[PDB]
Design a protein around this nucleic acid. Structure first.
Ligand SMILES: [Cl-]
Ligand SMILES: [Cl-]
Ligand SMILES: [Cl-]
Ligand SMILES: [K+]
Ligand SMILES: [Mg+2]
Ligand SMILES: [Mg+2]
Ligand SMILES: [Mg+2]
Ligand SMILES: [Mg+2]
Ligand SMILES: [Mg+2]
Ligand SMILES: [Mg+2]
Ligand SMILES: [Mg+2]
Ligand SMILES: [Mg+2]
Ligand SMILES: [Mg+2]
Ligand SMILES: [Mg+2]
Ligand SMILES: [Mg+2]
Ligand SMILES: [Mg+2]
Ligand SMILES: [Mg+2]
Ligand SMILES: [Mg+2]
Ligand SMILES: [Mg+2]
Ligand SMILES: [Mg+2]
Ligand SMILES: [Mg+2]
Ligand SMILES: [Mg+2]
Ligand code: NA
Ligand code: NA
Ligand code: NA
Ligand code: NA
Ligand code: NA
Ligand code: NA
Ligand code: NA
Ligand code: NA
Ligand code: NA
Ligand code: NA
Ligand code: NA
Ligand SMILES: [Sr+2]
Ligand SMILES: [Sr+2]
Ligand SMILES: [Sr+2]
Ligand SMILES: [Sr+2]
Ligand SMILES: [Sr+2]
Ligand SMILES: [Sr+2]
Ligand SMILES: [Sr+2]
Ligand SMILES: [Sr+2]
Ligand SMILES: [Sr+2]
Ligand SMILES: [Sr+2]
Lengths: 194, 46, 237, 119
RNA sequence: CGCACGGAGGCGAAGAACCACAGAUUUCCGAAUGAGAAUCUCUAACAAUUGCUUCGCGCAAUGAGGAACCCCGAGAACUGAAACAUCUCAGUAUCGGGAGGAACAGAAAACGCAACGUGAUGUCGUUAGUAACCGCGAGUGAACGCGAUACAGCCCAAAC
RNA sequence: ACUCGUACGGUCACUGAAUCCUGCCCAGUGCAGGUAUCUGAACACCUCGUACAAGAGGACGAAGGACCUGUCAACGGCGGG
RNA sequence: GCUUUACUGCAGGCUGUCGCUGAGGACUCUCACUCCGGGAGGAGGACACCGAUAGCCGGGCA
């Protein structure tokens, strides 16, 4: 039969409908008065969290991050530039808002490592994402078979190196075939053409 | 100018460095101080 | 070209800033819960460096010593009252609702309890005209009819230091001294006397503006000079 | 609060939480929102309990409409920790289910009736 | 008894010198961390940010360096087009953040010599200056496959 | 920033103590106000097209423009016959 | 380097539209959002701000 989780999931397919519409209108009011990075005791989307790798265990931290909506906050050229490079308004960043959120969270928690993240809605001027972070030094994780991989030295600063799922998807690494010529194994190895 | 205790230790070291290569080293090496500094001609740090 | 003087202004450097450290007080109205039971005696009459007008030093019943925007006639030993049931005398501050029509007021508020925004310069006054349960129409010194909330506090009387404008500065040295106590750059070099690189009106073999002085509202900062969005120019016609 | 459409009096809650404590020592109870959901779906639910202080509200949100489309009666409890102790756990529970009561069947029946009368 | 061949003197058969490993010591400033300061000073210190928590800094984490290499971001201009704006130089120079001894990638919502076919991923040779792009100008420029190198396949989420 | 500021303010410009004065011109350009009508983009909408899409057309029409008015101590002008 | 009714563009301003954004071609409302108030509360209000896009202006700048 259906899991209780499948109901939280079905609710989030349309965050502007039903009981969730009323819930978001209420929560976002308190969220707008909260900080940039706020640690929350329990995940808003339990199904997604658990699907992404979360467990109700010691050393598994979650946090909500608000990042501004829109394009790049760019300055105009102070020196000579040809027409193509004279833009300000239409220029967008190459990292999606979700990745900006994960980094802001990881910096707020210098000891923890980013596992994954998910969207928890948006208003007119900002977007909210909840990031699942893990303590790679707690024995509750060092002994957990489904999570101990994140304790390895080469997993340090994984979000700043784009090793997150949101990182790998943003790097053009989804497709294994056609279209991923300039993306795999890395953008830097391909001359920065992705 | 008012010097501090650390500045005084540094100037003190620089004054000692300003001595010549002793008579005996000349014989031990079978034969010049390149860090000879004058108060007027040369300039110290700080 | 180079940024014009009006663009260097916004950067807020020393040359353009007001000598805040040399200023006395941020002349705002007192805060009363309700009832009006707040009053005080005037201790001294001081000079406010920020406005070139006098300011009264008042001591209140609850130990509070504050400087207040002094209207004309206020002296040492006078008792001023602040609140809802205050006396209709010069120097007292009460909402527009309680103040009768045709009576000159000063230090008028925009939103209630803000501290006082309008009619604060040497000798000016706002004129209270119409009364309602909703709107109290005040005529500001510019001749404008400002529709206001009756709960907006105002001090009775005209601001002190009237007729300051009357006497000419006579010499540049006097303007210098006054300007040194404000947030302005002085002296003024005409744009028409500058180089092309420095101002839209700069350049030429003779001193004259390059294009017509009247500029659009939509003009960018660096171009918006001369007569800004003028509805007309000149004296005649 | 988004899923709560009726306030349950302090005394009606005491009658309910007392019925739950004797339901575990006789028949059977389901502890936890997942197990509560599968009881309503498999029809094996007699009376389902739900906490009011659930943060986030999504975990429980579905119970009031799921119970109403399966005939199964439900009741609200103020605190999460009281429902957990009632189910016989040191930790609190967001939702619990009474799957086939026992020497409380007469009480549960009346509580189910009292709630319908409270709309 | 350093470079370093003097003078005086001393150490070594109690095996010195010298070399290898291991240990002792290891001032102050320095990420610099009690606070301040041009290497000093003032009256107990994981400062700051975090995790766990006996909720006590009690137990831990981060910070900074490194020849380049690596990964994630920001991103020119000279120049070429015999001018020049798209294009080109070039995702170069330079800048921000960060890992390791290698990094990244990686077990198909693949390929598509279309098949009765191949079978994670990098890399090397080739495919090829081919397809494709382009004031269709100057210029720009892959992939599947093949031959090699090396090979290795697995864990959750949910159902119960 | 102006601003511990509030039109007797302060911003933006021109002229440059005093004295006698400061004519005529709003066609162009600028600024500003208005406007029946005309012109005026995209979203939504309507017709055609396409089992969808590209696309073609229509209706509505903002600021703006046309047109009208004000303004020269606004740019400037003040002749030939 | 500078100038402009040179060519091409880029900021900036004004304006429509979309999102935020809600209840009952002109209009009421309060709940988001904004501002004032120490607060109680007051004003404003689905507008404004902000994000996106479209037209106009645009040697301010390249
Ligand atoms: Cl990380
Ligand atoms: Cl002045
Ligand atoms: Cl094949
Ligand atoms: K170029
Ligand atoms: Mg590589
Ligand atoms: Mg000496
Ligand atoms: Mg004041
Ligand atoms: Mg004057
Ligand atoms: Mg000054
Ligand atoms: Mg001047
Ligand atoms: Mg000159
Ligand atoms: Mg210019
Ligand atoms: Mg002149
Ligand atoms: Mg002139
Ligand atoms: Mg220290
Ligand atoms: Mg060339
Ligand atoms: Mg050519
Ligand atoms: Mg290229
Ligand atoms: Mg291919
Ligand atoms: Mg002159
Ligand atoms: Mg404020
Ligand atoms: Mg130019
Ligand atoms: Na971190
Ligand atoms: Na690309
Ligand atoms: Na010297
Ligand atoms: Na050592
Ligand atoms: Na430490
Ligand atoms: Na502690
Ligand atoms: Na050339
Ligand atoms: Na040239
Ligand atoms: Na081209
Ligand atoms: Na004219
Ligand atoms: Na003339
Ligand atoms: Sr690190
Ligand atoms: Sr000298
Ligand atoms: Sr205030
Ligand atoms: Sr004020
Ligand atoms: Sr000129
Ligand atoms: Sr006239
Ligand atoms: Sr709990
Ligand atoms: Sr020797
Ligand atoms: Sr193989
Ligand atoms: Sr005209």
């Amino acid at each position: 039969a259906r899991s209780a989780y499948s109901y939280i999931r079905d609710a989030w397919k349309n965050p502007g409908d039903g009981q969730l519409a009323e819930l978001q209108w209420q929560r976002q009011q308190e969220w707008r008065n909260e900080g940039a990075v706020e640690r929350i005791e329990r995940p808003t989307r339990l199904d997604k969290a658990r699907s992404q790798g979360y467990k109700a265990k010691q050393g598994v931290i979650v946090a909500r991050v608000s990042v501004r909506k829109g394009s790049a906050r760019k300055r105009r050229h102070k020196a000579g530039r040809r027409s193509k490079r004279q833009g300000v308004t239409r220029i967008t960043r190459r990292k999606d808002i979700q990745r900006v959120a994960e980094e802001r969270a990881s910096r707020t928690f210098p000891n923890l490592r980013v596992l994954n993240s998910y969207s928890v809605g948006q208003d007119g001027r900002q977007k909210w994402h909840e990031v699942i972070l893990i303590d790679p030094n707690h024995p509750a994780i060092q002994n957990d078979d489904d999570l101990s991989w994140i304790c390895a030295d080469d997993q340090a600063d994984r979000v700043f190196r784009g090793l997150t799922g949101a990182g790998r998807r943003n790097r053009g690494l989804s497709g294994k075939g056609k279209g991923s010529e300039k993306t795999r194994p890395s953008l830097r190895s391909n001359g920065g053409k992705g | 100018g008012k010097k501090s205790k650390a500045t005084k230790k540094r100037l003190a070291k620089l004054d000692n460095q300003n001595s010549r290569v002793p008579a005996w080293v000349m014989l031990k090496t079978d034969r010049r101080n390149h860090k000879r500094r004058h108060w007027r001609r040369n300039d110290t740090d700080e | 070209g180079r940024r014009i003087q009006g663009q260097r202004r916004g950067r807020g450097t020393s040359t353009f800033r007001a000598p805040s450290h040399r200023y006395k007080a941020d002349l705002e109205h007192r805060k009363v819960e309700d009832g009006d039971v707040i009053a005080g005696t005037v201790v001294d009459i001081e000079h406010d460096p920020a406005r070139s007008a006098p300011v009264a030093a008042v001591e209140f019943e609850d130990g509070d010593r504050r400087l207040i925007l002094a209207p004309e006639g206020v002296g040492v030993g006078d008792e001023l009252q602040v609140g809802v049931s205050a006396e209709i005398a010069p120097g007292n501050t009460l909402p527009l609702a309680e103040i009768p029509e045709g009576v000159p007021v000063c230090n008028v508020e925009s939103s209630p309890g803000d501290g006082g925004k309008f009619a604060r310069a040497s000798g000016v006054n706002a004129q209270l005209l119409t009364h309602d349960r909703n709107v109290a129409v005040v005529k500001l010194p510019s001749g404008e009819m400002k529709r206001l909330d009756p709960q907006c506090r105002a001090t009775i009387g005209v601001v002190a230091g009237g007729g300051r404008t009357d006497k000419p500065f006579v010499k540049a040295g006097n303007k210098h001294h006054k300007m040194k106590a404000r947030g302005t750059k002085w002296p003024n070099v005409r744009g028409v006397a500058m180089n092309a690189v420095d101002h839209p009106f700069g350049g030429g073999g003779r001193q004259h503006p390059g294009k017509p002085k009247s500029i659009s509202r939509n003009a960018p900062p660096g171009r918006k000079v001369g007569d800004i969005a003028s509805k007309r120019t000149g004296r005649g016609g | 609060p988004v899923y709560v459409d009726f306030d349950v009096p302090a005394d009606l809650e005491d009658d309910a939480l007392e019925a739950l404590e004797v339901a575990r020592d006789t028949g059977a109870v389901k502890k936890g929102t997942n197990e509560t959901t599968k009881s309503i779906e498999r029809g094996s639910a007699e009376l389902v309990f739900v906490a009011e202080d659930v943060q986030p509200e999504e975990i429980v949100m579905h119970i009031p409409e799921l119970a109403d489309e399966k005939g199964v009666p439900f009741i609200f409890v103020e605190q999460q920790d009281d429902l957990g102790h009632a189910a016989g756990l040191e930790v609190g529970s967001a939702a619990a289910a009474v799957t086939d009561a026992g020497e409380a069947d007469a009480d549960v029946e009346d509580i189910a009736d009292k709630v319908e009368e409270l709309r």
